[PDB]
Amino acid sequence: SNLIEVFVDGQSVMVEPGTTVLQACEKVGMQIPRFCYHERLSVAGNCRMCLVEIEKAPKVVAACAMPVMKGWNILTNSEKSKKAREGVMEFLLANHPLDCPICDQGGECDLQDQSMMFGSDRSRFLEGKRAVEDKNIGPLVKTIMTRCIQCTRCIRFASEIAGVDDLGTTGRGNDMQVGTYIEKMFMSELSGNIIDICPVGALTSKPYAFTARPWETRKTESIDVMDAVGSNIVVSTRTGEVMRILPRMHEDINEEWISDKTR
Amino acid sequence: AGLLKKTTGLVGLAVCETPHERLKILYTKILDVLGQIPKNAAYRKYTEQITNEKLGMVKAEPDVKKLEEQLQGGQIEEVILQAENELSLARKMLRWKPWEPLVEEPPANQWKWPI
Amino acid sequence: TQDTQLIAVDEKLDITTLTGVPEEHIKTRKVRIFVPARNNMQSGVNNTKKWKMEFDTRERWENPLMGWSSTADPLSNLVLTFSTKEDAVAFAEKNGWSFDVEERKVPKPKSKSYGANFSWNKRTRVSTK
Amino acid sequence: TYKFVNMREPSMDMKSVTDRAAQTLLWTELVRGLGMTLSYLFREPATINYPFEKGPLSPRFRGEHALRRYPSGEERCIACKLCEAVCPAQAITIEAEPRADGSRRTTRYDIDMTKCIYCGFCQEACPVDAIVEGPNFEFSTETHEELLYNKEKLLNNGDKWEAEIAANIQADYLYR
Amino acid sequence: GVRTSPTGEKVTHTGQAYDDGDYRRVRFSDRQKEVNENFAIDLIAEQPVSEVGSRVISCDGGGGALGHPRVYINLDKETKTGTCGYCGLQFRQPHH
Amino acid sequence: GTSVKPIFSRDMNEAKRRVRELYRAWYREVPNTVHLFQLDISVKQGRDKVREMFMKNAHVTDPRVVDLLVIKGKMELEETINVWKQRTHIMRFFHETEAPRPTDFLSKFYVGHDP
Amino acid sequence: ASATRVIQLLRNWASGRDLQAKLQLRYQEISKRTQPPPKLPVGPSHKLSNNYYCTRDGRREAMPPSIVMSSQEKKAVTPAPPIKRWELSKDQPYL
Amino acid sequence: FRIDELEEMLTNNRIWRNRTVDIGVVTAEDALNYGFSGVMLRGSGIQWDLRKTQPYDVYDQVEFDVPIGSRGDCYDRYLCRVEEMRQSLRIISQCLNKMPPGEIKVDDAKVSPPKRAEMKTSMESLIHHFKLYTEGYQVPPGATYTAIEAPKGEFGVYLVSDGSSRPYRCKIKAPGFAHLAGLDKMSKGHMLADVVAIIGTQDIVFGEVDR
Amino acid sequence: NEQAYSLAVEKLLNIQPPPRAQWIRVLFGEITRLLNHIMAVTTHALDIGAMTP
Amino acid sequence: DTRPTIRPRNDVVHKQLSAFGQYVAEILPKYVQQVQVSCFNELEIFIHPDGVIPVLTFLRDHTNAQFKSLADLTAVDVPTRQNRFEIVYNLLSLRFNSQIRVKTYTDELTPIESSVTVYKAANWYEREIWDMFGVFFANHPDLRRILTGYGFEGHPFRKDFPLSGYVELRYDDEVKRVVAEPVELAQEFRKFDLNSPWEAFPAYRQPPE
Ligand code: SF4
Ligand code: SF4
Ligand code: SF4
Ligand code: SF4
Ligand code: FES
Ligand SMILES: [K+]
Ligand SMILES: [Zn+2]
């Protein structure tokens, strides 16, 4: 047909033309660490953690938004790729505030996990960090915007998924702040899902706020009954008590989102 | 041998006052047993090689102290002990017959160890 | 080729009585196998690449002392991993637990292109980055 | 290298055999030990007068757990639950909550002393030096329930053994 | 502050207080319900609001390495007082 | 697949034979273990417990499984005979301190959530 | 917990040694228990430059077990060269 | 000065030897097949010691002689233990004199917790400590049998890790297990006082054999 | 025992302890050797009858 | 040096052990299935069960092999594989000091022949496996239960066996003895969900399908 052969660090795979590099790597099993690309959301190439080395290519390219071409052995584990990941994360993890014991994302932070896997083990940041004032956007989402990494996932979720285009960015440079400028009231029926798209604890669940560290809660699959949609969910229960409800992936019922009423 | 060594140093075995003929007879016996073993078996090749080498050196050098040195097996008593064990092994697996191909393959993925 | 006095044994293994599990734990308990869905709070994937089996949750009462989570069933915090669901189901039947099967849900591969973020007429044009 | 321990075979001259016969008959090594023990009898007895005098300790001594607090009086524990995830015996249990002020303190913080194995893992895990093990070892109790501590009991422990813990931490934080 | 229950028991800083029937009060007869008086809720409120004049303020909780991890709170909002999440001291701009 | 390796017994008949003298030994044992261990069990209510335990695994039909139960009962027999076992372990089969457990669905509903 | 010379000579003669050189006791010679604050050193990879973890990871630089032979004229080889013989003790060969 | 003091009380004493000398001999050949290790081997006469042949850590740079037994009996093993005391003192002197300047934990923070100073000041150290005490260092998949010369005998761990934050199976080779396994052949005609003189240099603590 | 377990663990990790860590390890393992041999000899003498050692 | 933290690599021992692995593979092709040497210089031999006695004897007796010490004997239960239980024999050489490992597989019922004769140390170790994994050993001199309590059931190290077991024991005055009761914990074991969902080691990645 039209399937083009593309190597990944050696072995070759059959790839549909127009497929991004990261999807081609996922076809084998190895996954690019990312913060800006969500599978069911538009791409932005923003986190720059999606950088990877193309074989016989001078500069690394972003696997999030890169139409793969003929051949193109994807050197996932190349030394230059590791160095690019290290530097990009060092930049990401410079102004990040020292809230891991106090941030609810702790233990399932993504950023923490990438630091464990592909990141340094010491900080050379000798200067002061940046602090951003909090913008309240509801009794439903806890907001600590000094922890944000400007991955723009919340903005794209607001624009495409929810459709309420009120969550945006402000300013420029390192003082760029993602929020609502006006003290507006983000009250869509899908607002709670932003808690699960934010890689860091910048946006969290207010009702559940610091009730359990998520490495303790057992997870049991079930079905939402608040609506006739019957969205697949997972109940996180610790010590014989329900803490919260998270969306389960189904691709036919609820994708990976649930309503705030369900959540 | 001059003054025969009193104790080898290991209490599990005593001193053989006439070790050279012991090396000779045990080596000849195990060479016979390997002569039994079919030619194609790699065991016969390897063991005949090492044993004919050992017999050559023991019949060449008649000083016991140098015999241990070029025999790299410590005191001659543990050497004839190991020779008896080698004889026993060859005899025991004469009828075990391991030269045949593998009995059967392991079932599917029985050795991969990421789970 | 592997002569050890082999005997055709058609009926499936009944190691149940060998395992020592009590009668009501081997009969009443219902175990399900599944691929654990990834935590939506994370984008990591390598936790939905195995077949885990877990048992029905039982009573969880609070002790009079500190309101702890004392329970009675020992096979509550017990989860077993398996490479393929066939191994898991074989283990389940041979042990004798009533088993339930859920198929391995995997993400459908969607066509994604950055050129969709902009357009001349398509609705897919973004409004902010 | 190695040394043979017992190959010193004896000689057989008249002097050596007479000496050995005397030692066997006129018990000598017997008298040797009998006189050594006498030397230990007249020595200074090693004995510490408990409880008037206590054994020497070190600033790192691991003992009764306690919950410290900041100089302002606010408890240091922010309920990160790191200590609960660390305790090999799972003797620690926390329930957290958004307090009236807001600071995420523990609704429940109990350490099961009978489950605890006194390792000091909790204190080294604590990122705010909230949980610590005080120098106290004199808490042998009568009832099993007395050992099962509570959040209030831990706070009282941190408020009783406090100058101790502050002084020990001041003398040990550089090592750790 | 510590207050007495309608039964007479001393309430805790978490708000725990065994109710009227509440058969689990025989544990306290011939004994006492151990409660700590030094409530952390109010022992941080009376502390003065620091008036350091800069946009973003560092806080380690005092004692340097002995304090909490260094956090940079933002003294930006004019309508409230910034506070370090770990310790709780309220920091504010000196009325701009 | 269907072909498998035995432990001792070739067919249901010979394993059926092994359980026979296992019950033989248990029968001849029960009275003098009652006497030796100072059991509060009586002779008849000793034998019927053996009978009920033998009937407990009535459903087993795989041979190898039958060899496994017979050898485990053999270990049980050695543990009992030479007084390695203790009186409490002997009583363990008899459920004294264990309260009676209801069977009907109605009592199960009355007690608590349990199938 | 030193003694009289009359007893001091009695215990030494009974013990057949000069034990005053070192007793099982421990007097003022012990280390002080108020040592100054020690400035602890650092490790090798403490520089702020050329400390890339890619060229320093140990866990990541571990390959799977190298397969030698699978079910799917060389001479005889020993697992190790024969171990040599140790030397006798120069200080005290025989106790 | 007290090690020799113990020696003089026990070594040359008539009844310490008589109760112990040449009771329960163990043949050197039959010792190693029985899985015996440590002084149990050295008492019989095999020149084997993991501290020298397979030197873990810096034991190779340390000079020391081992006590090698003569008759393989109880008394030879006891003398080997005491000479091991003395060689231990010599080793202690050697390591005391030559300790180098350096850190205490591996500089790599992903496997060892970071120092408390960078904990409370640096992002990387905070995250690494949080995950290390939350998850821990995930170990690459693989199986090892690590053995050292524990004072009882050779002590080993068969640690097999699947490739996650948790181990898959650790097995304990304790020096006393094979010892008690062979304890039947150990005493085959000696009196009861002899079997209790045997379990002494058998030095069997019932915390590791039993696991 | 801690030396054995730790050595296994960072053998898996292809990591070596710093030299000072090795020296502390061997010094304290030898102190442990002294402790354990004292156990064996003294308790053995206790069984045999000797109480003073 | 440049790598002060990474453990030293000893390739000479690796090549020499690989040579001996080819040796032992050629000598006994009947039972050997797959020999490989780990990165940290530790060789493992995967043999068919029927070779428990022969291969070990060849490793115990052969002049050029010379392994007479049973360091330990262990089973590693893994429910996934068809024959769940795998038995590891650890041998140490004296003349040619080195550590070798031979590994065999068996399920719950298919017996595996008992070494004992090849290594009389195996006996107690042997019993442990039977008393701890259910792996019965053919013609073992005395395969009685060794570690667990009297009249026990199951085999605890089986991964399906619960951590807390099934039955505790305690005093009962009603019968004036220690009695066994079904498990009822005072506080349940919290099973923490470790093993972060991000890939750790790209080298050991499982191939797809
Ligand atoms: S969101 Fe920020 S503060 Fe929270 S765990 Fe992640 S890095 Fe730490
Ligand atoms: S607030 Fe959260 S989702 Fe939005 S850009 Fe920042 S990190 Fe991303
Ligand atoms: S010492 Fe502290 S952290 Fe360690 S087990 Fe005991 S209570 Fe838990
Ligand atoms: S580690 Fe310290 S701060 Fe965290 S929960 Fe435990 S005591 Fe509180
Ligand atoms: S995926 Fe490359 S930056 Fe978001
Ligand atoms: K989030
Ligand atoms: Zn603060």
Q: Annotate G40-52 with three-state secondary structure.
A: CCCCCCCCCCCCC
Contacts 24+ apart (CB under 8 A), B98-101: B98/B43, B98/J27, B98/J28, B98/J29, B98/J30, B98/J31, B98/J51, B98/J54, B98/J58, B99/B38, B99/B40, B99/B41, B99/B42, B99/B43, B99/J29, B99/J30, B100/J29, B100/J30, B101/J29, B101/J30
**What contacts H209, CB < 8 A, 6 or more positions away?**
H174, H176, H177, H179, H180
Cα F69 from chain centre: 9
Q: Can you tell me the distance from the alpha carbon of A46 to that of A33, in angstroms, rounded to the nearest whole number? A: 13
Q: Can you tell me the distance from the alpha carbon of H53 to that of A61, in angstroms, rounded to the nearest whole number? A: 52
| Residue bearing tokens 């006791």 | G25
Phi-psi region of F61 (alpha: psi -120 to 50; beta: other; left: phi over 0): alpha
Q: What DSSP string runs through C50-71? A: SEEEEE----BPPPTTT----B
DSSP conformation class of G32: P
| Residue bearing tokens 């120069």 | G90
- Peptide bond before residue H175 is cis, with ω within 30 degrees of 0: no
B72 contacts chain G (CB < 8 A): yes
Chains J and A lie in contact, requiring 3 or more CB pairs less than 8 Å apart: yes
Residue ranges for the known binding site of E are 59, 68, 84, 87
User: Among the residues of A118-262, which ranges form H helices?
Assistant: 153-156, 194-197
Q: Can you tell me the distance from the alpha carbon of A182 to that of A170, in angstroms, rounded to the nearest whole number? A: 11
Indicate the angle between helix axes F12-36 and F63-81, nearest 10 degrees: 20
Cβ(C82)–Cβ(C50) under 8 Å? yes
Indicate the pairing of strand A218-223 with strand E71-74. Answer: unpaired
Q: Can you tell me the distance from the alpha carbon of J97 to that of J81, in angstroms, rounded to the nearest whole number? A: 33
Q: Can you tell me the distance from the alpha carbon of J15 to that of H152, in angstroms, rounded to the nearest whole number? A: 34
| Residue bearing tokens 């020149």 | H47
Ligand 2 within 6 A of CB of A109: no
Structure tokens belonging to residue H92: 């202690």
Q: Can you tell me the distance from the alpha carbon of D120 to that of A111, in angstroms, rounded to the nearest whole number? A: 29
User: Among the residues of A21-75, which ranges form H helices?
Assistant: 21-28
At residue G90, the 3 state secondary structure works out as coil
Could you give the C-alpha distances from B70 to A45, B2, B55, B56, J136, in angstroms and in order?
A: 71, 19, 12, 11, 46
Cβ(B18)–Cβ(H52) under 8 Å? no
Q: Can you tell me the distance from the alpha carbon of D117 to that of D113, in angstroms, rounded to the nearest whole number? A: 8
Cα angle value A172/A175/A180 (rounded, 5°): 80
Q: What DSSP string runs through A135-177? A: ----SSEEE-TTS-----HHHHIIIIII--TT-EEES-STT-E
Q: Can you tell me the distance from the alpha carbon of A247 to that of A236, in angstroms, rounded to the nearest whole number? A: 11
Query: Which H helix or E strand runs over F27?
Result: helix F12-36
Which structural technique was applied?
Answer: cryo-EM
**What contacts C97, CB < 8 A, 6 or more positions away?**
C26, C29, C30, C31, C55
Distance C24 CA to ligand 4 centre (A): 41
Cβ(A118)–Cβ(G59) under 8 Å? no
Query: Which amino acid type is present at position D113?
Result: M
**What contacts B102, CB < 8 A, 6 or more positions away?**
G71, J29, J30, J31, J32, J33, J48
Structure tokens belonging to residue G26: 């421990």
Give residue numbers after which chain G breaks (C–N above 2.5 Å): 1, 72
Q: What are phi and psi of J203, to 5 degrees?
A: -65, -40
Query: Which H helix or E strand runs over H173?
Result: strand H169-173
Q: Can you tell me the distance from the alpha carbon of E48 to that of E39, in angstroms, rounded to the nearest whole number? A: 17
Q: What is the dihedral of CA A202, A208, A214, A219, to 10 degrees?
A: -130
| Residue bearing tokens 């016979």 | B32
Indicate the pairing of strand C7-8 with strand F3-4. Answer: antiparallel
DSSP conformation class of H75: H
Question: CB neighbours (10 Å) of residue J75?
Answer: 26
Pick from A199, A87, A112: nearest CA to A149? A199
Cβ(G53)–Cβ(A86) under 8 Å? yes
- Return the ligand number nearest the Cα of D129: 4
**What contacts C68, CB < 8 A, 6 or more positions away?**
A239, C62, D93, J186, J187, J188
Q: Can you tell me the distance from the alpha carbon of H41 to that of H67, in angstroms, rounded to the nearest whole number? A: 11
Q: Please name the residue whose Cα sits nearest to atom 4 of ligand 5.
A: A36
Give burial (CB, 10 Å; 0-12/13-18/19+) of G79. Answer: buried
Cβ(A191)–Cβ(A162) under 8 Å? yes
Could you give the C-alpha distances from B95 to B37, B98, F3, H67, in angstroms and in order?
A: 10, 9, 26, 44
Pick from H134, H23, J44: nearest CA to G68? J44
Q: What are phi and psi of H29, to 5 degrees?
A: -65, -55
Cβ(J46)–Cβ(J25) under 8 Å? no
Question: CB neighbours (10 Å) of residue I35?
Answer: 11
Query: Which amino acid type is present at position I14?
Result: N
DSSP conformation class of G20: G
At residue E63, the 3 state secondary structure works out as coil
Q: What DSSP string runs through C10-60? A: -SPP-THHHHT--HHHHHT-EEEEEPPPPPTT----TTSSSEEEEE----B
Q: Can you tell me the distance from the alpha carbon of J80 to that of D100, in angstroms, rounded to the nearest whole number? A: 51
Question: CB neighbours (10 Å) of residue B25?
Answer: 12
DSSP conformation class of C118: S
Chains F and B lie in contact, requiring 3 or more CB pairs less than 8 Å apart: no
Question: CB neighbours (10 Å) of residue A184?
Answer: 14
Q: Can you tell me the distance from the alpha carbon of D144 to that of D146, in angstroms, rounded to the nearest whole number? A: 5
Could you give the C-alpha distances from J31 to B107, J28, J34, in angstroms and in order?
A: 14, 6, 10
DSSP conformation class of E28: T
User: Among the residues of chain G, which ranges form H helices?
Assistant: 5-15
Cα dihedral across residues J75, J77, J78, J81: positive or negative: positive
Looking at the DSSP bridge assignments, the partners of residue J74 are J88
DSSP conformation class of J203: G
Q: Can you tell me the distance from the alpha carbon of A176 to that of A186, in angstroms, rounded to the nearest whole number? A: 20
Q: What DSSP string runs through J39-70? A: TTS-EEEEE-GGGHHHHHHHHHH-TTT----E
F97–J178: do the CB atoms touch at under 8 Å?
A: no
Ligand 4 within 6 A of CB of D82: yes
Q: What are phi and psi of J15, to 5 degrees?
A: -65, -45
Cβ(H190)–Cβ(H21) under 8 Å? no
Which residue among A98, A107, A120 places its CB closest to the CB of H134?
A: A107
Pick from F91, F97, F92, F84: nearest CA to F40? F91
Q: What are phi and psi of D123, to 5 degrees?
A: -65, -45
Pick from D139, D123, D152, D132: nearest CA to D68? D132
Q: Can you tell me the distance from the alpha carbon of B26 to that of B80, in angstroms, rounded to the nearest whole number? A: 8
Pick from J159, J31, J26: nearest CA to J103? J31
Q: Can you tell me the distance from the alpha carbon of A210 to that of D107, in angstroms, rounded to the nearest whole number? A: 11
Pick from J183, J190, J187, J192: nearest CA to J164? J183
Distance A100 CA to ligand 2 centre (A): 17
Indicate the pairing of strand A203-205 with strand A141-143. Answer: antiparallel
Structure tokens belonging to residue J23: 């040796």
D94, D147, D155, D169, best to mutate vs chain E, most E CBs in 10 Å: D155
**What contacts H190, CB < 8 A, 6 or more positions away?**
H23, H24, H198
Cα angle value E86/E90/E95 (rounded, 5°): 150
Q: Can you tell me the distance from the alpha carbon of J138 to that of J142, in angstroms, rounded to the nearest whole number? A: 10
Indicate the pairing of strand E71-74 with strand C7-8. Answer: unpaired
Cα dihedral across residues I25, I26, I27, I28: positive or negative: positive
Burial call J150-162: b when 16+ CB within 10 Å, e when fewer: ebbbbbbbbbbbb
Could you give the C-alpha distances from D151 to D66, D68, E35, J25, in angstroms and in order?
A: 9, 12, 9, 63
Q: Can you tell me the distance from the alpha carbon of F67 to that of F74, in angstroms, rounded to the nearest whole number? A: 10
Burial call H98-109: b when 16+ CB within 10 Å, e when fewer: eeeebbebbbbb
Pick from F65, B115, B112, F56: nearest CA to C94? F65
Cα A216 from chain centre: 22
D9, D44, D60, best to mutate vs chain G, most G CBs in 10 Å: D44
Residues of D in contact with C67 (CB under 8 A): 108
Cα dihedral across residues A197, A203, A208, A209: positive or negative: positive
Residue of H nearest to A119 (CA): H124
Q: What is the dihedral of CA C1, C6, C10, C14, to 10 degrees?
A: -120
Residue of J nearest to A212 (CA): J192
Q: Can you tell me the distance from the alpha carbon of C110 to that of A100, in angstroms, rounded to the nearest whole number? A: 34
Residues with CB under 6 A from ligand 5: A 34-37, 45-50, 62, 64
Ligand 2 within 6 A of CB of A158: no
Could you give the C-alpha distances from B55 to B47, D124, I34, in angstroms and in order?
A: 12, 66, 48
Give burial (CB, 10 Å; 0-12/13-18/19+) of G9. Answer: exposed
Residue of D nearest to J193 (CA): D85
Cβ(A36)–Cβ(A178) under 8 Å? no
Cβ(J32)–Cβ(J13) under 8 Å? no
Query: Which amino acid type is present at position D2?
Result: Y
Pick from E2, G61, J120, A8: nearest CA to H110? G61
Probe ligand 2: pick from A42, A198, A204, max atoms within 8 Å of CB? A198
Could you give the C-alpha distances from J155 to B98, C21, C22, C31, in angstroms and in order?
A: 34, 10, 14, 20
